[PDB]
């Protein structure tokens, strides 16, 4: 009853493939994109989908645009399989997989130099499908699966075959949904990523903490800090490399103990930046003469 | 440089009633790249600090 839309959301970028990359008739399927609302991680429809149980597309017309010149040529056929379990991948003939496409109602073929659309065929009854990740049966959570089949070798302007896998366009969705039963859906549909890696500073005074201010990060978002160092001869001089990193705001202690009797490379710092995309932490070394660099990785959730 | 910026400092406030920005290319159909064009309404949302 929570009807939202109509809006626009970018599904994926479609990558047309060369003639040598096509071997079996199953290899003509460029994209096999499930059109569940919880299947486009990072977009606006998927972020909303994790806050209701059920949904139903009232109008899901998928709008393809080219990203390619008009001087190269190839031909696509594109449809939405309403059954999420009818799999065209086990068809051993190359023409039968594209007759499988145009036979589905609501299908469309086009040159890939122009912008065409494929609408989603509504059911005859009133069935809602579930959001979230696909647990056991696909027929509960997927309303359709978008396919794009390459039917033509990718030629160029110069009369030659393209030898490289070429990104050839983009897929956008013009969507209009219902929803029901507001909730949270326990599996998070986000993905984490090592944002950047930057080394610890080299303090001058042994056993005195000088504060390292790092910049360049996004404002007012929470980060995670784990140490990582590569090819450092800590025994090139006397002393033991003992580091202790604490935030002045967050929580956690990164400890680097390169004593070869008891080794402790452990700990993690949870800290969030200020309004200016900066944060600071107390870096201290027991033996300041040991100038071997040690880094850390900034973990962040991107979507 | 436009007259609208010249005339804007002779009133206190404004409001865009209709504002449609119309991209004109100057390039043939032989080179290809895909753009996406929008007008964000918050002037402090900045995409320039996104790592993806």
């Amino acid at each position: 009853i929570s009807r939202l839309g109509p809006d626009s959301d970018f599904l994926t970028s479609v990558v047309a493939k060369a003639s040598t990359s096509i071997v079996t008739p199953a290899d003509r399927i460029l994209v096999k994109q499930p059109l569940s609302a919880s299947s486009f991680p990072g977009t606006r429809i998927t972020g909303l989908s994790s806050y209701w149980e059920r949904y139903k597309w009232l109008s899901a017309v998928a709008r393809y645009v080219p990203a390619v010149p008009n001087t190269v040529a190839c031909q696509f056929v594109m449809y939405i399989d309403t059954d999420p379990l009818d799999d065209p991948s086990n068809i051993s003939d190359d023409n039968q997989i594209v007759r499988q496409a145009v036979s589905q109602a609501g299908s469309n073929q086009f040159n890939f130099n122009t912008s065409k659309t494929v609408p989603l065929i509504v059911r005859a009854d009133n069935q809602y499908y579930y959001t979230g990740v696909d647990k056991q049966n696909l027929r509960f959570s997927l309303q359709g699966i978008l396919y794009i089949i390459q039917v033509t070798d990718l030629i160029n302007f110069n009369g030659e075959l393209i030898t490289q896998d070429l990104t050839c366009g983009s897929l956008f969705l013009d969507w209009l949904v219902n929803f029901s039963i507001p909730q949270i859906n326990p599996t998070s549909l986000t993905d984490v990523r090592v944002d950047k890696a930057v080394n610890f500073i080299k303090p001058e005074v042994s056993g005195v903490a000088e504060i390292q201010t790092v910049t360049g990060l996004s404002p007012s978002t929470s980060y995670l800090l784990t140490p990582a160092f590569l090819e450092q001869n800590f025994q090139s001089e006397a002393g033991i490399y003992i580091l202790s990193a604490t935030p002045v705001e967050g929580e956690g202690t990164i400890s680097i103990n390169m004593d070869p009797t008891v080794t402790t490379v452990s700990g993690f710092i949870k800290v969030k930046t200020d309004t200016f995309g900066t944060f600071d932490l107390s870096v201290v070394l027991t033996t300041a003469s040991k100038k071997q660099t040690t880094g850390f990785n900034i973990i962040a959730a991107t979507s | 440089g436009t007259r609208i910026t010249g005339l804007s400092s002779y009133w206190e406030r404004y409001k865009w009633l209709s504002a449609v920005a119309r991209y004109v290319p100057a390039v043939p159909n032989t080179v290809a790249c895909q753009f996406v064009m929008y007008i964000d309404t918050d002037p402090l949302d900045d995409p320039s600090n996104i790592s993806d």
Binding site: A105, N113, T114 | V27, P28, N29
Partner: peptide, 23 residues
């Protein structure tokens, strides 16, 4: 006898034409 039933188990496919200029 013979009877000619207009079978209604098909679907259309209308063809549209276009074409891009040089500029």
């Amino acid at each position: 006898r013979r009877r000619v039933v207009i079978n209604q188990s098909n679907q259309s496919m209308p063809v549209t034409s276009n074409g891009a200029p040089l500029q």
